[PDB]
Amino acid sequence: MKYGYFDNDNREYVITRPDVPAPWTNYLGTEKFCTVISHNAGGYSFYNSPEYNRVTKFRPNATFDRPGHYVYLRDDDSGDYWSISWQPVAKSLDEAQYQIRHGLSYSKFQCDYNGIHARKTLFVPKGEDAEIWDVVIKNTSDQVRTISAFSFVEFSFSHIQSDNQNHQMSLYSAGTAYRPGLIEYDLYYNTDDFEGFYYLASTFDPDSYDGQRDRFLGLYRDEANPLAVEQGRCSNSAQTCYNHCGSLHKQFTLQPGEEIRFAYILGIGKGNGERLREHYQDVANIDAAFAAIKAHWDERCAKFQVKSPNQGLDTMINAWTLYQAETCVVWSRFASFIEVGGRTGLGYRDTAQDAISVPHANPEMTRKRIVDLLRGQVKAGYGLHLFDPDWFDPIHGIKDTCSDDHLWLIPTICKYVMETGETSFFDQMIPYADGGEASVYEHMKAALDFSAEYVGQTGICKGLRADWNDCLNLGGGESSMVSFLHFWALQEFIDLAKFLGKDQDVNTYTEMAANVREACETHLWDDEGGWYIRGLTKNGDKIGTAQQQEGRVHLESNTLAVLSGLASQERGEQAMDAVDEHLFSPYGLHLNAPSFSTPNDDIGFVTRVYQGVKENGAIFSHPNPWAWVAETKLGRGDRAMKFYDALNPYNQNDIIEKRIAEPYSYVQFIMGRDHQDHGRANHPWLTGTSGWAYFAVTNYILGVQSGFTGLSVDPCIPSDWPGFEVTRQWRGATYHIQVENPDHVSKGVKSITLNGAPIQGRIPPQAQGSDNQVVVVLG
Amino acid sequence: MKYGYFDNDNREYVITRPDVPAPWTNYLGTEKFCTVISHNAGGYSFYNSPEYNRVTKFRPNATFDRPGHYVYLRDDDSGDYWSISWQPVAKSLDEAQYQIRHGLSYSKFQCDYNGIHARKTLFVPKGEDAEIWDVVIKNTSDQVRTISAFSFVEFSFSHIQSDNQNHQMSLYSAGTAYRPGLIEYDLYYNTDDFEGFYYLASTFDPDSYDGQRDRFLGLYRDEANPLAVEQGRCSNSAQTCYNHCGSLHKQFTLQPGEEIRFAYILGIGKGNGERLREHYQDVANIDAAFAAIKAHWDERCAKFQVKSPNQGLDTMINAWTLYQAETCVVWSRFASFIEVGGRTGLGYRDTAQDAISVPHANPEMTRKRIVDLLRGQVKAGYGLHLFDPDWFDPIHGIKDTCSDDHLWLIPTICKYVMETGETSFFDQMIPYADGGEASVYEHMKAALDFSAEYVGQTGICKGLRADWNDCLNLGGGESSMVSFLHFWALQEFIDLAKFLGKDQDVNTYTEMAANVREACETHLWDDEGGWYIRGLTKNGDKIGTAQQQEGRVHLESNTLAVLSGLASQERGEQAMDAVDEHLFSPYGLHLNAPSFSTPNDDIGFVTRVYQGVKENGAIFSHPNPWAWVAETKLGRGDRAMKFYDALNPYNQNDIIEKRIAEPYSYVQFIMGRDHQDHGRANHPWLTGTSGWAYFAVTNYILGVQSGFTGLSVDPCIPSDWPGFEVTRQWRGATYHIQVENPDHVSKGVKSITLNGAPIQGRIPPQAQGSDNQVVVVLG
Ligand SMILES: [Ca+2]
Ligand SMILES: [Ca+2]
Ligand SMILES: [Ca+2]
Ligand SMILES: [Ca+2]
Ligand SMILES: [Ca+2]
Ligand SMILES: [Ca+2]
Numbered sequence A, B: 001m002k003y004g005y006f007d008n009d010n011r012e013y014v015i016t017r018p019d020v021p022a023p024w025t026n027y028l029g030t031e032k033f034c035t036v037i038s039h040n041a042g043g044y045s046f047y048n049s050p051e052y053n054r055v056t057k058f059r060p061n062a063t064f065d066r067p068g069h070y071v072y073l074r075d076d077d078s079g080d081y082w083s084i085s086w087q088p089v090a091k092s093l094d095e096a097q098y099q100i101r102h103g104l105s106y107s108k109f110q111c112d113y114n115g116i117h118a119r120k121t122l123f124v125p126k127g128e129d130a131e132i133w134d135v136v137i138k139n140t141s142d143q144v145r146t147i148s149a150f151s152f153v154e155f156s157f158s159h160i161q162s163d164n165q166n167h168q169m170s171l172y173s174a175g176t177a178y179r180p181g182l183i184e185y186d187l188y189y190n191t192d193d194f195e196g197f198y199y200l201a202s203t204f205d206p207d208s209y210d211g212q213r214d215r216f217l218g219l220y221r222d223e224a225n226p227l228a229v230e231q232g233r234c235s236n237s238a239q240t241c242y243n244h245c246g247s248l249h250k251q252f253t254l255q256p257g258e259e260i261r262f263a264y265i266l267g268i269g270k271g272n273g274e275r276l277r278e279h280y281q282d283v284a285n286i287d288a289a290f291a292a293i294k295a296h297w298d299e300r301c302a303k304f305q306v307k308s309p310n311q312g313l314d315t316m317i318n319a320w321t322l323y324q325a326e327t328c329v330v331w332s333r334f335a336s337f338i339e340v341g342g343r344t345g346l347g348y349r350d351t352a353q354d355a356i357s358v359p360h361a362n363p364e365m366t367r368k369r370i371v372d373l374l375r376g377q378v379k380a381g382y383g384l385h386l387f388d389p390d391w392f393d394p395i396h397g398i399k400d401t402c403s404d405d406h407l408w409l410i411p412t413i414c415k416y417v418m419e420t421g422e423t424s425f426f427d428q429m430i431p432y433a434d435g436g437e438a439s440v441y442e443h444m445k446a447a448l449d450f451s452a453e454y455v456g457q458t459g460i461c462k463g464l465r466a467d468w469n470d471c472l473n474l475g476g477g478e479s480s481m482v483s484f485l486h487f488w489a490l491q492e493f494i495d496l497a498k499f500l501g502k503d504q505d506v507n508t509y510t511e512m513a514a515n516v517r518e519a520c521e522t523h524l525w526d527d528e529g530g531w532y533i534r535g536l537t538k539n540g541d542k543i544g545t546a547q548q549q550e551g552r553v554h555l556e557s558n559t560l561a562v563l564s565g566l567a568s569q570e571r572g573e574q575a576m577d578a579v580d581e582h583l584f585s586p587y588g589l590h591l592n593a594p595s596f597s598t599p600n601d602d603i604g605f606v607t608r609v610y611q612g613v614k615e616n617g618a619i620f621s622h623p624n625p626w627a628w629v630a631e632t633k634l635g636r637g638d639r640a641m642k643f644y645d646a647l648n649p650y651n652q653n654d655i656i657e658k659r660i661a662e663p664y665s666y667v668q669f670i671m672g673r674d675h676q677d678h679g680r681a682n683h684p685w686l687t688g689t690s691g692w693a694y695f696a697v698t699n700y701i702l703g704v705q706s707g708f709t710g711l712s713v714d715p716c717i718p719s720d721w722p723g724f725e726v727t728r729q730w731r732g733a734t735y736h737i738q739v740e741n742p743d744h745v746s747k748g749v750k751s752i753t754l755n756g757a758p759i760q761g762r763i764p765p766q767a768q769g770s771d772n773q774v775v776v777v778l779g
Helices: A160-164 A213-217 A227-231 A272-279 A283-301 A311-331 A348-354 A363-375 A405-420 A423-427 A440-453 A480-500 A503-523 A555-563 A569-583 A624-633 A637-647 A688-701 B160-164 B213-217 B227-231 B272-279 B283-301 B311-331 B348-354 B363-375 B405-420 B423-427 B440-453 B480-500 B503-523 B555-563 B569-583 B624-633 B637-647 B688-701
Strands: A004-007 A012-015 A025-028 A033-038 A043-047 A049-054 A070-075 A081-083 A096-103 A106-113 A116-123 A130-139 A145-152 A174-179 A182-187 A197-202 A208-212 A244-254 A259-268 A304-307 A429-431 A437-439 A462-464 A473-479 A667-670 A681-684 A704-706 A711-713 A723-730 A733-740 A749-754 A757-759 A771-778 B004-007 B012-015 B025-028 B033-038 B043-047 B049-054 B070-075 B081-083 B096-103 B106-113 B116-123 B130-139 B145-152 B174-179 B182-187 B197-202 B208-212 B244-254 B259-268 B304-307 B429-431 B437-439 B462-464 B473-479 B667-670 B681-684 B704-706 B711-713 B723-730 B733-740 B749-754 B757-759 B771-778
Touching: A025 A096, A025 A106, A033 A130, A049 A160, A070 A116, A070 A130, A081 A106, A116 A283, A130 A145, A130 A244, A130 A283, A174 A208, A174 A244, A182 A208, A182 A244, A182 A272, A197 A244, A197 A272, A208 A213, A213 A227, A213 A244, A244 A259, A259 A272, A259 A283, A283 A311, A304 A311, A311 A348, A311 A363, A311 A688, A348 A363, A348 A405, A348 A688, A363 A405, A363 A429, A405 A423, A405 A440, A405 A480, A405 A704, A423 A440, A423 A480, A437 A440, A440 A480, A440 A503, A462 A480, A473 A480, A480 A503, A480 A555, A555 A569, A555 A624, A569 A624, A624 A637, A624 A688, A637 A688, A688 A704, A704 A723, A711 A733, B025 B096, B025 B106, B033 B130, B049 B160, B070 B116, B070 B130, B081 B106, B116 B283, B130 B145, B130 B244, B130 B283, B174 B208, B174 B244, B182 B208, B182 B244, B182 B272, B197 B244, B197 B272, B208 B213, B213 B227, B213 B244, B244 B259, B259 B272, B259 B283, B283 B311, B304 B311, B311 B348, B311 B363, B311 B688, B348 B363, B348 B405, B348 B688, B363 B405, B363 B429, B405 B423, B405 B440, B405 B480, B405 B704, B423 B440, B423 B480, B437 B440, B440 B480, B440 B503, B462 B480, B473 B480, B480 B503, B480 B555, B555 B569, B555 B624, B569 B624, B624 B637, B624 B688, B637 B688, B688 B704, B704 B723, B711 B733
Parallel strands: A733 A771, B733 B771
Antiparallel strands: A004 A012, A012 A096, A025 A033, A033 A043, A043 A049, A070 A081, A070 A145, A096 A106, A106 A116, A116 A130, A130 A259, A145 A244, A174 A182, A182 A197, A197 A259, A208 A244, A304 A723, A429 A437, A462 A473, A667 A681, A704 A711, A723 A733, A749 A757, A749 A771, B004 B012, B012 B096, B025 B033, B033 B043, B043 B049, B070 B081, B070 B145, B096 B106, B106 B116, B116 B130, B130 B259, B145 B244, B174 B182, B182 B197, B197 B259, B208 B244, B304 B723, B429 B437, B462 B473, B667 B681, B704 B711, B723 B733, B749 B757, B749 B771
């Protein structure tokens, strides 16, 4: 079953039926004001901090996704009413036709019902901290129609906790006041004239309004049947205390075929509402704002475009996965329909990894997040697991430290400089979170040295998940994954030091890497099963062996052994063959197998998790891309693509009855074979899977990699591919890459010509604005 | 307008119309399992800790109070369905007749609709950690009817925060399994076989069941129209992960006039469900359990009964206010429809005050809370503002200390011993929260000494509310109220030391009290306005003077000046006359006047609060009873009763359109004259107003006071009262008190006779089980 389709021409996902088994969401905003909106217009907005500056409310994890940003239409001759979004009124789908088009930073809602055509486009314009509701109403009937429009948003008390609890305080913390076409919401305890005021305005001069939620909705009614909408007029309520809303109403008389256009604006700050309601009265200003949003992504998408034999890959890489990846980098991981309170700010390992994905499209935000992470690192070398970047924008101990967080930052910083050429970044002085300062280069060495220190007696990095927090504590237990990650970070740093001429560091870290490789190859390989173990308990018992009954094969250790470059080709192929044989499924690769069924605290919390769920036997998406990278390094492009196709949401567009979640977004995890809901995808949007998937496909399958001295093209594709084409923008120059595979191999470059001239090695960075033809022949 | 009436005979409040403007709630449970339930069956249950052991979910502060404990009935011949409680199905009130009877620790729901009579009694039986749903269905039509019943509860993830957020974890933290007539809910991460398991069972053998919320309710539906109920059968769902519910269904065939009875049981712990569903199959066991709940309160109510000319006073004192007061002592202040997360445990000043109210009815719980408070006190002498008694059941600094918390404990402990005669309690060794131990007596001296130390240069106690937390910080600013409270606590302690023969302490604290009185009479009286000021800013500016434009007269300082016994009769009368003239309203006494309109941090956060709201000009209920006590000490019974009648919820039974909240419960505050909603009552049930109101009426208006050596009867009533009667149980003996007022005075005892013999002074404690006639003649 399917509920929509991909519109490649307009870069939108079209939902043709609104009764989807779950809310399919989209993100509005590219700067500070953000809105998480569903195909049923359910959702909320926040400014900068989802935890402390929520703008409109949200009652999560319920059968309905309310409240939202709704527009109710009413036929004043009959009293009939409906919403432009299907919910909350939920007019019969046998009577009304709904369509939702989720685009990049905008969502279009459409409803055709009983002679009235209505469209509503929600988007956050660049340059403003507000959301525009561009509404168009057309009378498609043969008679004069009188239609009233009502907006609705329930204003938040700003702190999520204040919306969820402590109402003894929050119910008396705000008030509403009215001025022509503007409901002004005052957070009374927040004296900042900007952050302490919200508003809902209309470009039309209202006939009525409501600032009190209980008056608009009415007693024993909810968003599905507001009293104001039913009776055809608001109560013109506005007062201090209790729950507030932003409802503006206007009646329109439409001749047959006549259409009208107007807008509502939800925003923050005194003075902005009166200004924008006037500004957008000239619809040309709305169109101009929308055009800027289209341009924003056109510019980004154009920096990497691919044309290959795989339509699913092309569709996702050329738009959706880039979009999801950058969304993570810009908005972080704590504002969705799943993350709705508590954790806020930046997760160290999450953003460190996310930031490696789109420096080619958004270098400024990538640099910002990297600086945030460097500022969130302590002198010891590790990073604060969870912190608010605003804290350090001009601290926990080793017990709460997660052994891998800081290491992910190394490859990411190296990639950022490779991409932008900002080599001076390494000399920039950045303060440590716990006092003092050091250059970016030294921050990096502090991270590498930390992991070299925190190892066991056999030379393996400490790290094991004891509690329910996905954190590799240092309280006992060694992790194969951390050692492999350390090796990878070391290889990256070695290349850097070599490029910078830091001979002393080259020797130091080459030696360190050498010791890591020897220790891993000696202690982590299981020659009975033919794979790498997950690690060892604090008592020295190997976890992930061929002799154990549960948790024998682990995805993370085996994929990273190869991705890092530590594993030999021989062990790499066998380990990945075990991954394929024991972990592959039509929905993607399982994290481990068999699932754990016996609680064992020496192994970790994973033994206390349901089978086929989360860390215990589920298809955890994040590590899947690592398997693709591993396969490309082994030269098995067909194997890599088998894995890619299985996880690609695009290919599951017509199995929603099983997947449930959005077919345009990667999710945190899919229920594994051991759970009765095997196949159901959970937690779309804010997952590191998107950044890694984008990175894996662009840099390893398609094989396009920026470097310190040149651009490399070394693809690993399915042998049956006749070739493919990529448009890559790097350091201000364009590279039109054409890959030819006449001998039908998977990997191996026979020749590369730059502008008609054969070259050997990487492509040197060309002049600013230059357009270069690059022909790569595999063989 | 009214929505019900008081049924004095059955000690229940009868709601005859369910479309009340707000949820009118009741509390089920007397031991550890508690349920906050509304007249629409909305609400939730928790075990011991509302924060960490919630049993069923609750979506607060919304237009509907859901979810709840619902029973849906369906006519299987027509497909029509409705709930026994009006909501959530909300059958037209022109078609169905609903009645709800809230009783002491039980609630009866009734629905008469289209030939079917149904009753549902919810109550938590003593001895079990569960809630019984006693259901009776009767066919009152002239034809055979086939009716199906469905239960519904949405199981909580136990931690309130886990229900509200962090679903990335909680959605995979539980599961359901089914056994005949029992849905077993497993909190997977809680290994305790008792606390880590909930259940919903039925005495009947089910025809179908549902453990998955999404299957019972169905897609794009909610509690108002469950798919299972509409289709007439559950889907027999049960699995791990996602949201769970407890739905058991059974179809019944009823002959005309035939009725059936069965029960659902919501509870905690493995093994209990199978046991209780079987136990209650014999309805006699349900009746026996209900009888125990009636007995529980019959015993308590009988210990103090009054018959006076004031029906409102009698109705409330004989049942409702005692009930509300004891509810606060037993369940604390953090579980209602307003307090739904965050703060949990015990508020020091809240419980210290609450515990003075019902030692005559529940001495065991009173003693327990007193010990909790003593354990929550630090060596320095102050108490932890908010703490969990379980923490100390076998710490903040002076910056987070609230200057009055510990002082309230003194009069409360003295009262407890006076009431029970447990003089040995003073010698009991109790550990301080921050290490070490001392006798109860010494704990008390530590509190008194602390306040003597933390005073200003003029001798007034430090204390002023700087932030939004109702805490009198010691960071600068002096409080009249704290000094008066200190004096009151000192007078109480002096009487104690005198009784115990501690001459040295008698001299020490008499001297301390003397200094407090001199300092207050010298610096806190405003001879221009004729009242006591609120206090002084850290800069020495008096707050609450006749010359100021805002916040001139304050209720707390003026009432306590008299209640404490510090103020002279002359200043007392004038100060209280100012209270009457400037603060009295038909809804009760305002906290201060005029309201503040200019932010002034030297004065406190009150200057940043909306006018007529909370601390700034609202009718804050808590201090109102202090005014009654003050008036009785001044001998003005008519004035005291004017105040009592104005705040008494009972007298507002027919002005619900203005009051909104329950007419049987005191609330935290009523909107003041300065707010447009003046008259609206906010936050019923968990307010110290109930304990203080009970204490004020029983001990001061009716004037019955237990003492260390005898029982005192010194009433202060309206002059037109011909007299009144009280039945008082004290230390195992009964005192049948008859007060005669032939000369129509307000206060002053001419004579007192004990069992026919005239006596002078207090009534000596009589023999256990004795019944004594006490005749008091005023004159
Ligand atoms: Ca404000
Ligand atoms: Ca510096
Ligand atoms: Ca160019
Ligand atoms: Ca359990
Ligand atoms: Ca001891
Ligand atoms: Ca007796």
